């Protein structure tokens, strides 16, 4: 019952929600209208790390809900089921979606965080990823 | 086109996915079986900060998808639509769900991150939240 952990986890969740809103409201690209961030997370999971059940757990979704969500991405021909696999279009989509995101966050963070803070964040987050990621 | 920003944002997204998996796979509480993390995010958004359209943007979901998701939470009587509002049950659920989460993360982080790192994370994340959160 550590107040510091309550606040750390709450802040993490807030940075996700408020960053998500900032990006959706602030970029112009058609892909950031066509594809939700939750859809982009399916594509980036297949790209990097996927069965329907594993996807559900990694996205924090009930297994029962994941079928109907995958249907929309199959209809858009960004994934296929064979495991889930990216199509060439899906790879093209998630690379450009990510480029739009990274360019936008880099321009927002200019003159608000310094190089020292960015470099520290990389070491802190690699460490946190290694703690959390199960074998 | 800053490599450091690409890696920072990618790491943030990975800590979300791998932390989500760690918690779902590692805690015992009935609420962390009944309620998905995505459902818990609707309850915590109403609790803290909600129209259907605002919720969609903050969760990174298409507006078209949010109705059918809210239906399950209405059927469980954790929310009502009147804006979205928490019920007493919804408040009870999200307080216990959060307690389970915070207790678990605090025990996982014991002897893996030090007090200095936790306290630094609070200052860094308050700053990042303030940059991202729109008016
Ligand atoms: C002090 C901060 C330095 C790190 C530089 C920025 C890291 C950004 C991490 C939070 C990003 C939140 C955006 C969520 C949107 C998304 O990933 O789709
Ligand atoms: C060096 C780190 C110190 C901070 C202490 C822990 C902060 C944890 C932040 C990542 C939590 C990820 C868990 C996601 C699950 C969820 O919130 O439902």
Residue numbers in the entry:
A (entry chain A), B (entry chain A): 1 to 49, 52 to 84, 93 to 145
Q: What did the published study say regarding this structure?
A:
Multiple antibiotic-resistance regulator (MarR) family proteins are dimeric transcription factors. Binding of effector molecules to MarR proteins gives rise to conformational changes of the MarR homodimer, which sequentially result in dissociation of the repressor from DNA and induction of gene expression. The draft genome sequence of the psychrophilic bacterium Paenisporosarcina sp. strain TG-14, which was isolated from sediment-laden basal ice (Taylor glacier, McMurdo dry valley) in Antarctica, has previously been reported and a gene encoding a MarR family protein has been discovered in the genome information. The crystal structure of PaMarR exhibits an overall architecture comprising a dimerization domain and a DNA-binding domain containing a winged helix–turn–helix motif, which is commonly observed in MarR family proteins.
The structure of PaMarR in complex with palmitic acid has been determined at 1.6 Å resolution. The crystal structure of PaMarR belonged to space group P41212 and contained one molecule in the asymmetric unit. Specifically, the side chains of Val15, Val23, Trp32, Leu111, Ile115, Met119, Val123, Ile128, Phe131, Phe135, Leu138 and Leu142 in chain A, and Ile5, Ala8, Val9 and Phe12 in chain B, form a hydrophobic cavity. The carbon chain moiety of palmitic acid interacts with hydrophobic residues, such as Val15, Val23, Trp32, Leu111, Val123 and Phe131 in chain A and Ile5, Ala8 and Phe12 in chain B [Fig. 2(d)], and the carboxyl acid group of palmitic acid interacts with the side chain of Glu13 located on the α1 helix from the other subunit [Fig. 2(e)]. The palmitic acid molecule was probably derived from the LB medium used during cell culture and protein production; palmitic acid was not supplied in the crystallization step. Accordingly, the B-factor distribution among PaMarR, BsMarR and StMarR was analysed. As shown in Fig. 4(e), the DNA-binding domain of PaMarR exhibits relatively high B-factor values, with a disordered region between the β1 and β2 strands. The conformation observed in the PaMarR structure seems to render the effector-binding site narrower, creating an effector-fitted structure.
